[PDB]
Design a protein around this ligand. Structure first.
Ligand SMILES: *[C@@H]1O[C@H](CO)[C@@H](O[C@@H]2O[C@H](CO)[C@@H](O)[C@H](O)[C@H]2NC(C)=O)[C@H](O)[C@H]1NC(C)=O
Ligand SMILES: *[C@@H]1O[C@H](CO)[C@@H](O[C@@H]2O[C@H](CO)[C@@H](O)[C@H](O)[C@H]2NC(C)=O)[C@H](O)[C@H]1NC(C)=O
Ligand SMILES: *[C@@H]1O[C@H](CO)[C@@H](O[C@@H]2O[C@H](CO)[C@@H](O)[C@H](O)[C@H]2NC(C)=O)[C@H](O)[C@H]1NC(C)=O
Ligand SMILES: *[C@@H]1O[C@H](CO)[C@@H](O[C@@H]2O[C@H](CO)[C@@H](O)[C@H](O)[C@H]2NC(C)=O)[C@H](O)[C@H]1NC(C)=O
Ligand SMILES: *[C@@H]1O[C@H](CO)[C@@H](O[C@@H]2O[C@H](CO)[C@@H](O)[C@H](O)[C@H]2NC(C)=O)[C@H](O)[C@H]1NC(C)=O
Ligand SMILES: *[C@@H]1O[C@H](CO)[C@@H](O[C@@H]2O[C@H](CO)[C@@H](O)[C@H](O)[C@H]2NC(C)=O)[C@H](O)[C@H]1NC(C)=O
Ligand SMILES: *[C@@H]1O[C@H](CO)[C@@H](O[C@@H]2O[C@H](CO)[C@@H](O)[C@H](O)[C@H]2NC(C)=O)[C@H](O)[C@H]1NC(C)=O
Ligand SMILES: *[C@@H]1O[C@H](CO)[C@@H](O)[C@H](O)[C@H]1NC(C)=O
Ligand SMILES: *[C@@H]1O[C@H](CO)[C@@H](O)[C@H](O)[C@H]1NC(C)=O
Ligand SMILES: *[C@@H]1O[C@H](CO)[C@@H](O)[C@H](O)[C@H]1NC(C)=O
Ligand SMILES: *[C@@H]1O[C@H](CO)[C@@H](O)[C@H](O)[C@H]1NC(C)=O
Lengths: 68, 404, 184, 35, 49
């Protein structure tokens, strides 16, 4: 917790530094919180940026309506 | 006979700063005699640590519950023409590298041993992304996206729906759309100008930050208190006095510092409970006054509700209610019923209003007179039982329709 | 577990202290044990009171939810279930309650071309309760949450204003049911 | 109130609504077009 | 009511305990008494909160 571990796979977060887990470029939906949006899970143990949700883009026009 | 749209802002705290403490580091620090003596007091460390971790988890759930109400991050279309409504002061700007709206930037610029501070799970960028997604969803999909899939609805159409939801028909918006667009833009401009006009506008967020900082400062300041002992240094008492009196002096110091820590923990628990109640209120307002239109009077804004927008704030949320204030009234003379051919007549949805000579039926909140017709009236009973009735004729389309 | 803590006394067992010591020192040993256990009990009562206040708030919210979503239908969005709310059933639970929200969730959307109003013979027409939806050739009204096209009829439309102040209108005729009725 | 076409709206056919009943419905503008 | 309790001290009156006893032990006795009174005040403040 809040230690720049240069005096003790080593990854650095804004909540501290993490030992024993690697980093993944892609983002997954997470379950275990850490702090500063770097969630950790178990697919070894991986740590990733929090998935904010699906990047759904909705179109728009001024004469377009959608009815279920 | 006229309407004025006013934009009012309200501020609700969401979550304050998480705090975790260390027992031995705050109480003793380095002296192992204090660490040996603390074990005599029993389990007065695990209780405090569990309580403070529970506070941290509860505040994390608080800051998650009010913003994470959508499962899809919605993208605002690159074009910003919605039909005359200038939505540039609250949408994110790509020029700023922080993905910060000017309202969000104005809000963010107006807020300023053994005691670690855990960072929040959600940083400023992710809650900014949630607020941008919510604003995009309520600006391009109406209130449907809070129920199921988002549907593309034009902005004037769902504005007409929001007028139809407050008892005014959609024959008042499409006639002066330029005027209502000008009023909306002027309202956004004046709330931007007057949000930072007074330093007491952002009262609650500054208050919760100031109380948290003062509580932590008072906790730190207790380390330089003698508590009835010779000195306030653990190393000074142990290396100068005999152990029979050092035992009593250290015991007095430990019970004083433990009482201070218990008082701080109780204060933090009370403050966190209050913040959780305010966060539940903010979550209800998020799920009611943003994802849809609420018909409760004076719950979101001083007036009839149309829609509202969320804006991210440091350790809190800031709303922009868009109300409907019907100023500039003009009075008339009325009657509850109209008698014609011996049978009573009643208004279907409006009220019978006479300007002195003739009679008209009009909506309950906008003076738009119409000729009384049998299509928007219904008959019931006779002319004797109802009181206050007046004599007047009723227009019927079949009388000029048949003879043609 | 606070019973086994010595609290800086000779021993945690009280009868041992009363059976091993004279009252001149048993008085101060008793005093230390009493103040330690009283502080522990004060902490326990404070935590219990806070948790009971939290449970009171949650139970008030649950009673409001029961009174507004079982005894009736609540029109406000996303208070009882994720979507339009129909009705709910309560279920008994040990030290709690469990609801069963029954929600109305639309699906299978379809693209359509709209217009705010229709102009006919110089006077504008507006939908009484729906919205003008065109599939490309003809124009129909439909209710806002389910697709059900109907022919444009003067009974479910009302006229207001001229053909100029309203923007974005389209040209289409309006079926008047009285004209063929009078032709028979 | 007497059942008219003013307070009713038509939809579909008489083959799918479960529990329907047989009854004629009064219509307005009837003793009017022939007079 | 809690104002007039002994709190494990010799007495519950300030003038009675600051006169008869010797100050090396009267200081400890009155320290215990004001500690008890402060604890009672803290309990009342927490209840009021
Ligand atoms: C209703 O009020 C609005 C403003 O509150 C009026 O709009 C003004 O109209 C005058 C014309 O006499 C213009 O000079 C002003 O610039 C308008 N104000 C704005 C903000 O655009 C409007 O005339 C009033 N009446 C109606 C029927 O809408
Ligand atoms: C639908 O919206 C688009 C913008 O998304 C409109 O495009 C505008 O066209 C006019 C033509 O004079 C330009 O002046 C605007 O600058 C354009 N939009 C922008 C970027 O502001 C389009 O006209 C709209 N069509 C309607 C009203 O149905
Ligand atoms: C929406 O309103 C804002 C604010 O009134 C407009 O931003 C102004 O733009 C002009 C011209 O670029 C500048 O001279 C002002 O300094 C801007 N004001 C602020 C506060 O930034 C913006 O142009 C408007 N957008 C539209 C499409 O009308
Ligand atoms: C009450 O309203 C009616 C119509 O809204 C007014 O009648 C009109 O008056 C003007 C003024 O001379 C005439 O040009 C119109 O032909 C009248 N309409 C008709 C006869 O259908 C009436 O004057 C108003 N009364 C008052 C006292 O203002
Ligand atoms: C509306 O017109 C009717 C016409 O019948 C009025 O009823 C008559 O009113 C006079 C004056 O009070 C009585 O002497 C008659 O006995 C009434 N006849 C009937 C059949 O009721 C009625 O008063 C008028 N109402 C108003 C408000 O002017
Ligand atoms: C839009 O919907 C209308 C209504 O169903 C369609 O019109 C029908 O087209 C079929 C195909 O020949 C005809 O058999 C029907 O008689 C038409 N209906 C009426 C009431 O005349 C129209 O084809 C649809 N357009 C598109 C592009 O799908
Ligand atoms: C519907 O059709 C009529 C046909 O007359 C259009 O009216 C013409 O509109 C143009 C451009 O607005 C004018 O230059 C003509 O003078 C109009 N003719 C008449 C007889 O008034 C009308 O604009 C059409 N409506 C839409 C929405 O396209
Ligand atoms: C840790 O220290 C090194 C060297 O002092 C520094 O380069 C690095 O930025 C520090 N870590 C963080 C997260 O700032
Ligand atoms: C993630 O991507 C960045 C940019 O390409 C790269 O520098 C980094 O090494 C990647 N992470 C891992 C674990 O390889
Ligand atoms: C109501 O109308 C009357 C005339 O009909 C007028 O004298 C009076 O001032 C009006 N009331 C108000 C509050 O304007
Ligand atoms: C409707 O049209 C838009 C743009 O043309 C498109 O992005 C969207 O996928 C369409 N929806 C359906 C259901 O086809």
């Amino acid at each position: 917790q809040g230690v720049n571990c240069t005096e003790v796979n080593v990854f650095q977060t804004r909540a501290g530094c993490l030992i024993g887990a690697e980093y993944v470029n892609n983002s997954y939906e997470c379950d275990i919180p850490i702090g500063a949006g770097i969630c950790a899970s178990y697919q070894s143990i991986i740590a990733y940026t929090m998935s904010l949700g699906a990047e759904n883009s909705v179109a728009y026009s001024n004469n377009s309506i959608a009815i279920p | 006979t006229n309407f004025t749209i006013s934009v009012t802002t309200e501020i609700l705290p969401v979550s304050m700063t998480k705090t975790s403490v260390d027992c031995t580091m705050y109480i003793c620090g380095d002296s192992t005699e204090c660490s040996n003596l603390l074990l005599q007091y029993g389990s007065f460390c695990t209780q405090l640590k569990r309580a403070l971790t529970g506070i941290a988890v509860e505040q994390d759930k608080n800051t998650q519950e009010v913003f994470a109400q959508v499962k899809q991050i919605y993208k605002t279309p690159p074009i910003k023409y919605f039909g005359g409504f200038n939505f540039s002061q609250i949408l994110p700007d790509p020029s700023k590298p922080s993905k910060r709206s000017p309202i969000e930037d104005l809000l963010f610029n107006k807020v300023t041993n053994g005691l670690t501070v855990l960072p929040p799970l959600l940083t400023d960028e992710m809650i900014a992304q949630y607020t941008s997604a919510l604003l995009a969803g309520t600006i391009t999909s109406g209130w449907t996206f809070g129920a199921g899939p988002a549907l593309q609805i034009p902005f004037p159409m769902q504005m007409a729906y929001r007028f139809n939801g407050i008892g005014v028909t959609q024959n008042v918006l499409y006639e002066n759309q330029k005027l209502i667009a000008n009023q909306f833009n002027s309202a956004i401009g004046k709330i931007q100008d007057s949000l930072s006009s007074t330093p007491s506008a952002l009262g609650k967020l500054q208050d919760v930050v100031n109380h948290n900082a003062q509580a932590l400062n008072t906790l730190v300041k207790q380390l330089s208190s003698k508590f009835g002992a010779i000195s306030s240094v653990l190393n000074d008492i142990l290396s100068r006095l005999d152990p029979p009196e050092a035992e009593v002096q250290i015991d007095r110091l430990i019970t004083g510092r433990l009482q201070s820590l218990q008082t701080y923990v109780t204060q933090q628990l009370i403050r966190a409970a209050e913040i959780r109640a305010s966060a539940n209120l903010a979550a209800t307002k998020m799920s009611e006054c943003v994802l849809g239109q609420s018909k409760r009077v004076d719950f979101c804004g001083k007036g009839y509700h149309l829609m509202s927008f969320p804006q991210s704030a440091p350790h809190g949320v800031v709303f922009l209610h868009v109300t409907y204030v019907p100023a500039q009234e003009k009075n008339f003379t009325t009657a509850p019923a109209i008698c014609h051919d011996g049978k009573a007549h009643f208004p279907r949805e409006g009220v019978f209003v006479s300007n002195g000579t003739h009679w008209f039926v009009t909506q309950r909140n906008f003076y738009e007179p119409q000729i009384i017709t049998t299509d928007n009236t219904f008959v019931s009973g006779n002319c004797d039982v109802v009181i206050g009735i007046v004599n007047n004729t009723v227009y019927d389309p079949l009388q000029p329709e048949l003879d043609s």
